[PDB]
Design a protein around this ligand. Structure first.
Ligand SMILES: [Mg+2]
Ligand SMILES: [Mg+2]
Ligand SMILES: [Mg+2]
Ligand SMILES: [Mg+2]
Ligand SMILES: [Mg+2]
Ligand SMILES: [Mg+2]
Ligand SMILES: [Mg+2]
Ligand SMILES: [Mg+2]
Ligand SMILES: [Mg+2]
Ligand SMILES: [Mg+2]
Ligand SMILES: [Mg+2]
Ligand SMILES: [Mg+2]
Ligand SMILES: [Mg+2]
Ligand SMILES: [Mg+2]
Ligand SMILES: [Mg+2]
Ligand SMILES: [Mg+2]
Ligand SMILES: [Mg+2]
Ligand SMILES: [Mg+2]
Ligand SMILES: [Mg+2]
Ligand SMILES: [Mg+2]
Ligand SMILES: [Mg+2]
Ligand SMILES: [Mg+2]
Ligand SMILES: [Mg+2]
Ligand SMILES: [Mg+2]
Ligand SMILES: [Mg+2]
Ligand SMILES: [Mg+2]
Ligand SMILES: [Mg+2]
Ligand SMILES: [Mg+2]
Ligand SMILES: [Mg+2]
Ligand SMILES: [Mg+2]
Ligand SMILES: [Mg+2]
Ligand SMILES: [Mg+2]
Ligand SMILES: [Mg+2]
Ligand SMILES: [Mg+2]
Ligand SMILES: [Mg+2]
Ligand SMILES: [Mg+2]
Ligand SMILES: [Mg+2]
Ligand SMILES: [Mg+2]
Ligand SMILES: [Mg+2]
Ligand SMILES: [Mg+2]
Lengths: 77, 100
RNA sequence: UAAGGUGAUAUGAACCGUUAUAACCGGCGAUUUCCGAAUGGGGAAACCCAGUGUGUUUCGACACACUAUCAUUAACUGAAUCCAUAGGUUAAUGAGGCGAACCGGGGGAACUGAAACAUCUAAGUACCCCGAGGAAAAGAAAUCAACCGAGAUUCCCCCAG
RNA sequence: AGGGUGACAGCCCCGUACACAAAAAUGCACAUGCUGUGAGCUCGAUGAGUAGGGCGGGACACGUGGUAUCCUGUCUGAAUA
RNA sequence: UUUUGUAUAAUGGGUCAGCGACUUAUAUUCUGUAGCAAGGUUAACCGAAUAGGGGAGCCGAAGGGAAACCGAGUCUUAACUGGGCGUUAAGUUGCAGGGUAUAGACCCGAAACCCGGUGAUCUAGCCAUGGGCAGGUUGAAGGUUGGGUAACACUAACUGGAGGACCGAACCGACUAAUGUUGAAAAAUUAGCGGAUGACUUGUGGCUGGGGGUGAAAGGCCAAUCAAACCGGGAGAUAGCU
RNA sequence: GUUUAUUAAAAACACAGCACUGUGCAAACACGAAAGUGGACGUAUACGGUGUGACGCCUGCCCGGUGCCGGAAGGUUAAUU
RNA sequence: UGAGCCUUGAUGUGUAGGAUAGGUGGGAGGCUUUGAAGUGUGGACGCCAGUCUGCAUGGAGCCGACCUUGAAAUACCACCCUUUAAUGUUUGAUGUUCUAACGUUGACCCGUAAUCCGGGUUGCGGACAGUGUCUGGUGGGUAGUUUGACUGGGGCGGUCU
RNA sequence: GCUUGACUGCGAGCGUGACGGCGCGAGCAGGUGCGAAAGCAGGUCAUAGUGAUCCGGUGGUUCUGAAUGGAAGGGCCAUC
């Protein structure tokens, strides 16, 4: 599913609003990208489907800590 | 992304020069190819522990190497009994095996 | 608890019992085919077909038990590829499905009304979905207040159409 | 109270008021026994891709309105009694 | 019943019996009636449970002005001879009723819109696997032989057996007529008619699902239903109409 | 040959043939939030779409309009800043 | 090929003049053997006067209060207005190259007695492509709707205050 | 010829409309113009020359100003 493994960002629903304020249901999808992350503590690349925000979370927190959060949350990576 | 360089990168720095590198350069090249590691202000003291600890264990040896050359001119006189006879030939007994 | 009982349509037959294992009532047990989550594999539900291991004074064959999937954990095993990881085998624990309403969450109409209609309304209703519980949710101020003060949340009456 | 009984029964029958009852199982409460979790005092610490912002939407009675406040899909991004 | 107007040849009713349509709730206003009266009354709740408590509040006793503000006055205006609204008029809570409001809102009644399901045992197309086409005609290419050619070509006979080929049963269809039209049958029967080795036909199973399918295309077919199936739900949709 | 099962079998539909156009393969195109599937285990002598409709003689003039193709100078022109 | 910027280097003719005077403080001499003056000369400025500066030879010399002048020396310093040179660096644009993200519906290997998938190796593309958010365009492909009344029936026509 | 009464605030009382509204209006206050003065003038001989509300725009007005002071916004008068 279109779900970020780091942040949990999911598709969320909303409205497209025209100039006449006609409301048609839409979706807001996350900016998901499958990315290979180097884990220096495992000598290994880990591939995660991650939002661009999740990548910034990884840069700020470190992949070792983010993977610890995942394996606590299940989320078999 | 602030990184500390673990090695000389050509156009950036030299074995520790915290520079502002684009995150893709660091994320995908400098960290996996171990030229750098991010500057968390723990790695600015954890692998600049090589800047900190490997330097900090040198200031006390610099001071302890001064008290070792203090006992030099203390004794300076030994009972030497192997006489330089007719112009100094070694036959006697002074060093390195056994006195009882 | 008992002098009457063997459920009913529903008689009759053949019997049981009458001072305490007749029947009746209640507690705790026990038996509890096949299907069905159905779980050994399959399948046109109530059928078909196995495997392994135990045992069986005829060696024709019988009896019992186990064998699903996922998750978590552990042990043993084990690639590409040195360690390793993936993977694989076993064991242990738990889950699985059902169910009226209430509950929280994820999605989410239109008829309709506007005396047309698009904003708006209907309505976050109906409906679909996930999940839980006896209730759920909420909840211990980064809240209100107005310079006086109140003191988590929830529900009822007002405030106020 | 009520229900029956050959028509309408306080006194015919079953019941009712009232008073009694449990070998066994089980619940809600009190006390206690065991194994878990740690009260009380001292100095400290005080939840960051977060608050806030831009874009788009949603929720707040409140339709973007002069629109505070909350949520966040997207891009960003502080302070730290 | 509907109408200007119906014996009307306008509507409706075969008859009887039974059922079948102005309700309910909460607000608001007026009337009546009762209570208290410049006051009236409590709501939730408590409860000593139709009591009593509870006066939180609500309406009323003052209005004017957009408002600040003033106040039996006030607003207007720089200010009124003045003018506008007010002041000289008892309300309030029950009970009952008439109206209004919101709800299905007197009852019945659409075509339709949306949501979620069920359906390709009919039909349409496709997929796989199997079967069917009596009998009789025609006589393509090619081949053989002989002739002919420098050699090819070309030519005659014999052979050969092509074809969305011909005639015609099964089989598949459905051009015409008549019958039938409360049928024997919600599409047939009878006499004729077309195709009948093919773009044929048929059995069994399979796939495609509703704004979707499928369609040699008729808006045709998708279970006797199709310019958007069926079932259930939203739903008592709405109906200025009957 | 096909068709309005159940009032229309036809001149309608289809047809071989013709033309235009798209398509260089992860093809275009289509069904699909997507994965993927068909196209096709095919590769431009192929596939898709469109129109015309055996064959024969043929298919004339018009690019202003609408569309498509190509051009990109300049004019105008969004978010953004 | 476009702009920023600490710091230093260089841009300054009213006339008085030996002539390319922004100004205040700080002062009596700074510069010159990690190299002077007199010459040739590279690329610039230019009021055409000469300044700034690179380079080579050169080896003990350039510059003051000056006579003048509202201001007296780039004699050393310090701050800074007008002026334009230069990088580290800052972010802009086009193109080229690279690889390490990303892609691979290329090959081989393993999982694995598997044309799925994943991992690995390698090649090829490669910061493109593709995807998300935002955004202009296009958009009967699809959807929701509108398309008046009067009227000697309606429509056409006419009318509407 | 001279001038700005094509004035400001009001308005007894009337007319006309279902209503919205439209019309006529002496006279009062203030301040103007013309006339020597009486007086006349609140547009034009009269009857057509027009558009409700909403949403907003401009100017004025310390009327209001969501703790308070301001402001925003709103209201009021004028006007588009
Ligand atoms: Mg099974
Ligand atoms: Mg089984
Ligand atoms: Mg309507
Ligand atoms: Mg709406
Ligand atoms: Mg306080
Ligand atoms: Mg906040
Ligand atoms: Mg926002
Ligand atoms: Mg707001
Ligand atoms: Mg009539
Ligand atoms: Mg008559
Ligand atoms: Mg008659
Ligand atoms: Mg009639
Ligand atoms: Mg009649
Ligand atoms: Mg009748
Ligand atoms: Mg009757
Ligand atoms: Mg509608
Ligand atoms: Mg639907
Ligand atoms: Mg559905
Ligand atoms: Mg057919
Ligand atoms: Mg034939
Ligand atoms: Mg027959
Ligand atoms: Mg026949
Ligand atoms: Mg025939
Ligand atoms: Mg038609
Ligand atoms: Mg049918
Ligand atoms: Mg329909
Ligand atoms: Mg339902
Ligand atoms: Mg109805
Ligand atoms: Mg034919
Ligand atoms: Mg027909
Ligand atoms: Mg016919
Ligand atoms: Mg044609
Ligand atoms: Mg032509
Ligand atoms: Mg063009
Ligand atoms: Mg349409
Ligand atoms: Mg009409
Ligand atoms: Mg006139
Ligand atoms: Mg304030
Ligand atoms: Mg405030
Ligand atoms: Mg204002």
């Amino acid at each position: 599913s279109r779900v970020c493994q780091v942040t949990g960002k999911r598709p969320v629903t909303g409205n497209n609003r025209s100039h006449a304020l006609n409301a048609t249901k839409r979706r807001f999808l996350p900016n998901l990208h499958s990315h290979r992350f180097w884990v220096e503590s495992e000598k290994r690349f880990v591939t995660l489907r991650v939002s661009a925000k999740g990548m910034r979370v990884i840069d700020k927190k470190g992949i070792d800590t983010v993977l610890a959060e995942l394996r606590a949350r299940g989320e078999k990576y | 992304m602030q990184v500390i360089l673990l090695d000389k990168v050509a156009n950036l720095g030299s074995l520790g020069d915290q520079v502002n590198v684009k995150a893709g350069y660091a994320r995908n090249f400098l960290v996996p190819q171990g030229k750098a590691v991010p500057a968390t202000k723990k790695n600015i003291e954890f692998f600049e522990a090589r800047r900190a600890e490997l330097e900090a264990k040198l200031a006390e040896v610099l001071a302890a190497a001064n008290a070792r050359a203090e006992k030099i001119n203390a004794l300076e006189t030994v009972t030497i009994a192997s006489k330089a006879g007719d112009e100094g030939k070694l036959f006697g007994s002074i060093g390195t095996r056994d006195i009882a």
